[PDB]
Amino acid sequence: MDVLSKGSLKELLAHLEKTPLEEAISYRIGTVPYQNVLISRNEYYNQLYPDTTSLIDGVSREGQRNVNGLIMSIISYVVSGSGHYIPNIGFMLLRRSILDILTKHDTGLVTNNLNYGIIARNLTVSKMNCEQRKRMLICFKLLAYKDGNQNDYEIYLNQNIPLKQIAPNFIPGDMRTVIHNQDQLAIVGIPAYRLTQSTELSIRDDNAKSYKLGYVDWYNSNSFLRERSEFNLIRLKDRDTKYGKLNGW
Amino acid sequence: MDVLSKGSLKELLAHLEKTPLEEAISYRIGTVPYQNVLISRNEYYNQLYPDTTSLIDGVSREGQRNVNGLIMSIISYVVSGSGHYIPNIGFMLLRRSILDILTKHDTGLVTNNLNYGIIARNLTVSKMNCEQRKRMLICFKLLAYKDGNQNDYEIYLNQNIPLKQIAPNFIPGDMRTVIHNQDQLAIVGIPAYRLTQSTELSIRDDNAKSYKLGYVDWYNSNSFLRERSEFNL
Amino acid sequence: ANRATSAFLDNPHPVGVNYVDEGSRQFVAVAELLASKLIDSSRESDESNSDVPFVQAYSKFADDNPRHLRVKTGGKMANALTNVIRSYYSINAPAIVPQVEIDRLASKATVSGDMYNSYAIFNSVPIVEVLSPARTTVSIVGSDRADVTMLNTGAGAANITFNFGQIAETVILKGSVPFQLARLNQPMPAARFTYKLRPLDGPFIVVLPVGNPLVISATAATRIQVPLAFNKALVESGFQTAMNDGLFDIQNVNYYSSFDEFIISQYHAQDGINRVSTCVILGLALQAYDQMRRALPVR
Amino acid sequence: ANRATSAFLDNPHPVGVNYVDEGSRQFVAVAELLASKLIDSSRESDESNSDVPFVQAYSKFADDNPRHLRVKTGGKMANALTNVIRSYYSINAPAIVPQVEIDRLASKATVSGDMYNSYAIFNSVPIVEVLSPARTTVSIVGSDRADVTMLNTGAGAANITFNFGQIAETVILKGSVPFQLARLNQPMPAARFTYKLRPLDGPFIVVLPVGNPLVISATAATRIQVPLAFNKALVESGFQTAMNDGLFDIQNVNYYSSFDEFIISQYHAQDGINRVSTCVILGLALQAYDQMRRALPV
Amino acid sequence: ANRATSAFLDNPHPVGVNYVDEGSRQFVAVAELLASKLIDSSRESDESNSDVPFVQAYSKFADDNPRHLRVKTGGKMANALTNVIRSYYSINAPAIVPQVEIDRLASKATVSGDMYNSYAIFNSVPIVEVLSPARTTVSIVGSDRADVTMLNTGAGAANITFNFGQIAETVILKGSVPFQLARLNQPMPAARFTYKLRPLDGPFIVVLPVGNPLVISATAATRIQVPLAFNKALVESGFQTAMNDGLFDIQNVNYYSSFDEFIISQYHAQDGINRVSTCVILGLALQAYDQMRRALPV
Amino acid sequence: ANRATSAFLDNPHPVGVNYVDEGSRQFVAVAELLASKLIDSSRESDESNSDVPFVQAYSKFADDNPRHLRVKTGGKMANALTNVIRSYYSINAPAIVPQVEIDRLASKATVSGDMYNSYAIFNSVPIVEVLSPARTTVSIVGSDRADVTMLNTGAGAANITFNFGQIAETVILKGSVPFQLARLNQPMPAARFTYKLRPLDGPFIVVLPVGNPLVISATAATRIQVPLAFNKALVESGFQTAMNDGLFDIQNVNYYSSFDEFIISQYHAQDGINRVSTCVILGLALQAYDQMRRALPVR
Amino acid sequence: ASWQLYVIHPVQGSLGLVVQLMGDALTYNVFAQYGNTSASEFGKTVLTGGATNTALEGTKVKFQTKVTAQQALALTMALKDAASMLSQGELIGYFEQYINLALEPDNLSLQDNM
Amino acid sequence: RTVADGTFNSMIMPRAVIANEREHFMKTRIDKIE
């Protein structure tokens, strides 16, 4: 919910710096990812409604124990709000931030063998919307810069024409590029249209609307932080600053 | 609607005195009765609703040209509110009052051969409520006493025990019996407020419900519209 | 000799003879007018997220206020309209709506129940009979466009008689190959692709040469008097809706693909002029039915 | 044994899964509402002999006043409407329109993007399979009216099995000559011209006598839930406009003569109830495309 | 060939056609509501050591104060409730209650009288027909749980046809030993203990191997629309009470073990959907009869 | 030897392993409590002739105000409850309800997620196996009351071994005729009509004399821990409703006639102590489902 | 509703008669007994007196005529004129008696017209 | 079709051949002759 609310590149990377890896990993068993299932949608149909479960749903799924599953759990958390079930990763890796895993070699995780095409296909890039594809491409660029695979990232964009048009423009080592970026990455937000307490047909759409309706409740909740009215009560370390720089950028 | 509103024997007899036989006969061609049909009741069921047509429905039906048909048309008007299609009866007979047909010999009609059991079966007495049955028995007693068939009416009541319990307590030709009668014969009255604008499953129940709901509107507006045509006659 | 006829013209079942008086015609016109208000109010209610426009229209239509516990089906007005529709379709369907209810529902709105203000055009092509010699095969297929496939195997050319009903105004014939057609006891013209015919002139004769088959495509236009509110698009939709809901499931009745086939078939039967008037009233009733069901949906 | 099937029911391509939420549904509804006013503004312009009704309608639709220099295109709404139409047709088409742009355009007018208010009747005739024995020829042709021509050259009468699926509600069969039809394990009635059938009843057997060919004409009626603003005449015109304008030219997609054929083909595919909702939204989008492009040709 | 049918499905007698209108439906609902308050007031009187709560409840129900030297019978409401129960069962019942009396009793409380606000599940299993070939014996026992015992004496395996009607929603079949069952014109599956069936899916064929008898236990569930105040436990008690009191003792009627069998049997009769509405009102009246008679025994 | 077993005990399919934590248990209890308010409000609306009590309770249940022309189904709460029910039944059923939705709905009302406050009695009779000699026939029918029919065709008396499992508390055996039953390696007692048995005592031997068949009727009672809000009548009604609506139609699952059969079958399978916990939550969920649909019906 | 249809095939004759009575409306058609194809039992109509529907469905009673086709036609023509002034029982009773018993109608005026 | 009277329907009604003396006399005579 909090990760889906971020609407700018600066906010997204700032959230990932303060968020540990354990938030990406889920400890609920879930179900196997790719299955043709029948779900109940009584608002629309009397018969059961066919659908296919996927990894970018908002509900936890079972994940492979390899490094591929860990990266695929991080991206699903960013684009869908929930991760997958990969237990016994370890204290050392789980305490690191999401940005450290994606960008830093000191974590101890080796990810240079990853194939962006296979990861995108397993994440069902075809079913993703524009904001979801932009968020995943941000994760790919950070991984490419960590492994020195910038050339491979560019070629993968050349093969996929729709991905090249929406590819965010920022150098993963320079903070000046992040501040200038004006891409809108928000998935949930205050809706200008009429939003009703109604169900959706597919699993992805229904789960997304739950976060959208939950965010509205979160926005008016006491947990939400109102910068306009309570800026002085925020701690100085985590207070918003114009000259905000990620470490090493 | 006027005939169904009467709730006492003396009101009902008074209405029949002023009502010509024309009002008890319909000019609409209608449909043949005793037919198994499927009707649409979408308030309750998606499928068609089985039912059977009858003479005592509120809708006009084709009638026979015999005397039996004319008596059945009179009774149907009393119990259901509508008559039957019997064409070319005659101007002189149609001008006579309903009570004249039932209780007077000057009309020129012969009703001695009528079988009360057959007439009741043709009118589906098994499907009639208590108020409808009492109205039908009033018409039988009037016809029986005109023909000198008082004994036959009593014997017919002995055979049908349930009809004997609700038999009207009046002797035709005696004014004292009519004055002191305490029967309730109102099929249609000012509705209890609990009544709603909803359909009923059966043909008979829905048509009776239609008369009940439209009685309030008819009560307020019938006098002026009747007078607008009655004057300068 | 062989005889071929259109499938939809065969044995038109008798139509109802009830609810055709002036008062009943007013009831159908009022139902169409009030159903149009109902379908418009539902659009306004959806746009404004308010039930005020729909409650006002439903109360006018059904004489009752919508309730959450109950089910909105149209009320007594809906019950009468559906049952009168069945009565029009067949004489076997009963008449179960009392005249008091018909008079009450006709007073809701003030309209003139005139079913002859305007005209409408129907495109069903009537082929009453096609007569062919022994050695020829003739097949008739279609109602909106009739394709007549004819093949001659005999030694000599065959004369084939085409009889179109006297009702239709204009018939246009187009062949896959040029052919000769002429009226009875009239000279044969040169072979041409297209003929325009008036069926009232008389039976037509087509000369079939031996060899490749000839296919004739027929289209027709007939004008039938209808009320001004008549809408063929809405009437056709209501006809299919009534069939799917089982309103026309009556014993010993014939079934048709469209209202155009129904009205043309009943016109071509004996006492067709009397039958068409009832069908037109049924067309307006079906128009009211379609708008009412779309406004009040049942899954 | 030979098997014959309808040509338009073969291999329905997967439809898109984007732009089918509440926010996008109201965008299509707003476009349909505002495109209707664009057409109606032309009639109002004639009455007043002024272009100010059209300017008002165009400004609301395009967020900019029309200019005599350039051709009227419709602005951002037209670009968004064109792209969502492409995405609906095929899964391979990109979803390039951002959510924020859909968010802003859906706020122009007040509507509810509910696509299950009403119903529409679609007339495509589904014939999944016609099973015929040897020495018989069966040809199925047509979608709105399916003509099945059957000829048997064998010694005796043959039995032909007809399978109309399970989705269609009513199928009417009319023969050139009277024929016999009955369900599986049922007695065969007298020859009759017209049969009314329900596809859920089961497979149907037709006696094919030896001799002249027998042709059966089939008409079908299917009810699909659609929004109240649905107009089949405008949806069908929009389908032809989009096909001619090259909005459906994507790799590995199937093409159909009408929206009637398109919606029924996806309905009869495996897990076809998922595709029906998306195709309905595409129909409303095509209704807006037809009105917008007729007012502003390009 | 032999035919076996359930005992309770045979010859449903005609039901009454009186006291089924809106005014009479409210009276039955009024009686149920006031009868429930009689039971509750008696419990309150016992706990509070005061007869004041019972006096109010009896006065409302019976229009008269309780008296020590007069038998507590429930007044005119009890007589009217008893008489309508007799009328509902058979068309030959007298049906002598006046309309003025029914209307005045429906004014004692305000209730809708709607008999379609809810639903109830009925467990009676309807085996309309079991068709068995020669050299096989089939016996059907029970209504709530139907046990079908089949013996194959002949040389080879026999096919047995099961017909469950078109009204029941679902039917579960369980066997003593694994058995094969399939629909008409369908391949037989591997033998298994339990089958779940939809009765509308045609007759079912059971393969009966030669040897030890095979016993099939059948359970079915049917949903019938009932008012919200419907309570199956109280309806069942009232049905047994009414039979013992002689309310159902009329000429030319059929008797059933439970109200479950009564309602299902009338449903399966020709044009049985007419009777099901009257049977529900009878069930509600029996629910009022049970509570009233338990509070005021006679 | 021949082996016979109860039909409902055979092959219990695995139950779901999702939505069994404290947060999900609170959501089911909240749904049951709110569904009970929904059914009582509808009764109050009938008695008061006002829709205010029902609209008041529907808003809490569905988080939305009822609007005319829109079908009342229960809102997002109904969607979560129906899909969670499917997951409890089978492990093949998908888990599609997000954790954010479960937490939000669980906060609507204050209630405990405790599922072990009270107990209930279940009457399914577990007959794990009946072992018989060669010349005898044994048939077992019924679940609530199990009738075992035994016929001996051999020369002498035969011994039939009865295994009732280890879970059931008491088993009462009634015979059509007096019969002898004793434990393993125990002298046979005099013939008696009835026997009260403890299933933990061990396998039981029945002497079957040569002659007329002997029928033994078995009744069993077992104790399972359930929440205080558990109502057996409501749970059973919901189980049949869920079956009719098709929520239990999943691949490779077993179907039971009653919830009593379902819970006993899962208890007797391996790791049945863990399975029975999930079944209890399903029973409470079915109780909420039964009350929700009876308040909001569909024709 | 009472309707009745009579099909008379005289063995001693060359013509047949079809008589239909729907209520009090009597119609007849004289048909040839020769030239019939196997499809229909009636030849071409030689004399017409209205429209007769032979496809009516109901119980069929077989009888043998005791009068010639000319005698049956003579009574049918007379019965048509007196259809309005006679009851249905009289219309039937006179026709059945003449066809089946060769019994002349008791009504003297009707007898003269025949 | 005009309205139907009851004249035809009374003719085809069954008769009491035993109770009626004239009907019994006639069938005894025919049985004797045969």
Residue numbers in the entry:
A (entry chain P): 1 to 249
B (entry chain Q): 1 to 233
C (entry chain H), F (entry chain J): 2 to 300
D (entry chain F), E (entry chain K): 2 to 299
G (entry chain W): 287 to 400
H (entry chain U): 25 to 58
Would you copy out the relevant sentences from the publication that reported this structure?
Here, we report atomic cryo-EM structures of three states of BAV virions—surrounded by 120 spikes (full virions), 60 spikes (partial virions), or no spikes (cores). The spikes protruding from the outer capsid shell are heterohexamers composed of a VP4 trimer capped by a VP9 trimer.
Visual inspection and 2D class averaging of purified BAV YN15-126-01 virions on cryo-EM micrographs revealed two types of virions: one surrounded by more spikes on the viral surface (hereafter referred to as full particles), and the other with sparser spiky density (partial particles). In the full BAV virions, there are 60 spikes sitting on VP10A and VP10B, respectively, while in the partial virions, there are only 60 spikes on VP10A. In contrast, in the double-layered full BAV particles, 120 spikes made up of a VP4 trimer (for membrane penetration) and VP9 (for receptor binding) emanate from VP10 located at both type II and type III channels. The C3 symmetry is broken for the three N-terminal tails (various numbers of residues were traced) within one VP4 trimer, which are involved in forming the asymmetric interface between the VP4 trimer and VP10 monomer. The VP4 trimer has an overall negatively charged patch near its C3 axis at the VP4–VP10 interface, while positively charged residues R65 and R121 are present on the VP10 side. At physiological pH, VP4 (pI = 5.9, negatively charged) would electrostatically interact with the basic VP10 protein (pI = 9.0), suggesting that electrostatic interactions between the VP4 trimer and VP10 may play an important role in association of spikes on the virus surface. Binding of VP4 trimers also results in a total ~1800 Å2 of buried surface area on VP8 molecules surrounding VP10A, which is ~10% more than for VP8 surrounding VP10B ( ~ 1600 Å2), likely contributing to different affinity of VP4 trimers for the outer capsid shell in the full BAV particles.
